[PDB]
Every structure is written in C-alpha cells, then in structure tokens.
C-alpha cells in the first residue's frame, strides 16, 4: 500500500491503435566543445585564395 514499482510495461500488439503502436525514436543533439570539431558534413572542400 502506497509502495509501487516505478516502471511498467508497454502493451505492444500488432492490432493496437496507431496511437498505442510502437514508435522508434532517435534524437540528434549537436555539440561544440572546448575541443576540436571532428564531426563534419559531406560538403566538398576547396583550395584557399
């Protein structure tokens, strides 16, 4: 009484409503540190003028 387990399972059946269906989620966070920038885009580099 008044002592519960903090977690609970999802009920994921293929017949569940889209609202209750499982969705995979990925969150991309970008970070500039006090360190070299090592993650870069595919943009081609050019010569310097």
């Amino acid at each position: 009484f008044n002592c519960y387990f903090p977690l609970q399972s999802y009920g994921f059946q293929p017949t569940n409503g889209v609202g209750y269906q499982p969705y995979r989620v990925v969150v991309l966070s970008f970070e500039l540190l006090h360190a070299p920038a090592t993650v870069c885009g595919p943009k081609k580099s050019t010569n310097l003028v």
Epitope: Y4, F5, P6, L7, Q8, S9
Partner: nanobody
Framework: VQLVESGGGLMQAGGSLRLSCAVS????????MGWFRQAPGKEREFVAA????????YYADSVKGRFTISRDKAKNTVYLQMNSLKYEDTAVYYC????????????????????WGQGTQVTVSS
C-alpha cells in the same frame, strides 16, 4: 523457453516440502514468477507471485504464514517453501512466468501468465 518443476510429492500433514521451477532457454527479461495449483475437479487457483526485480512477494490468503516464495536470479529458479502442510494443499502445482511488468504487485494474482510448467503433484497424508 521451458519451465522445469521439481520437488514435492508425498508428505504427512504438518510437514514441509520445497518446490523448484528452473527457467531454461534464451529470455529477454523476466518480470515475475508465480505458483498456481489445481486440486482434482477444482479450478486452477493462484498461490504466490514474486517480482524478479527486488523480490517482493504476493500470496493467496489460504497460504499466508505457511508458504514462502523466493527467487535465485543467477540460477533463474523460483521456489515455493510449503510449510505446515494441510490436506487442502493436495494438488498439482504449476510454475508460471511473465515478462509483463505491472507497477502493482497484486496484479500478479490475476494476470494471465505467458509460460507454464508441466505441473508437480503434492499429496498431503494423515
């Protein structure tokens, strides 16, 4: 996934028996284990449940103060220590397993379990 029960059998009233139920095969997770029993001509009836995480136990009224459910996570085994045996305890005892995590332990008394053992006879004599 298989539930393999052992122990039990014949014991005189007032005595104690221990049932074991070992889980074999690849499991992703275990939420809870339970013991049920079915006496001849009667409906299968909840006995006890234990949450795998933390080991909190829930008991049918009929076995409180007499039976203890316990778990060995490393051996993937649940136990029922059946003390102060009475004739009314004579039944086939079934191990059950679920991956369903309820916040509410008492739910394990009425939850339909996913996996069942073959059943082990306990017979209490005079």
């Amino acid at each position: 996934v298989q539930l393999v029960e052992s122990g039990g059998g014949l014991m005189q009233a007032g005595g104690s028996l221990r049932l074991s139920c070992a889980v074999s095969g690849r499991t992703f997770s275990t939420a809870a284990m339970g013991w049920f029993r079915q006496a001849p001509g009667k409906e299968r009836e909840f006995v006890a449940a234990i949450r795998w995480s933390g080991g909190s136990a829930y008991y049918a009224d009929s076995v409180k103060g007499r039976f203890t459910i316990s778990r060995d996570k490393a051996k993937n085994t649940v136990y029922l220590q059946m003390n102060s045996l009475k004739y009314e305890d004579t039944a086939v005892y079934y191990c059950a397993r679920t991956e369903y995590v309820s916040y509410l332990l008492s739910d394990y008394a009425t939850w339909p379990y996913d996996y069942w053992g073959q059943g082990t006879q306990v017979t209490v004599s005079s």
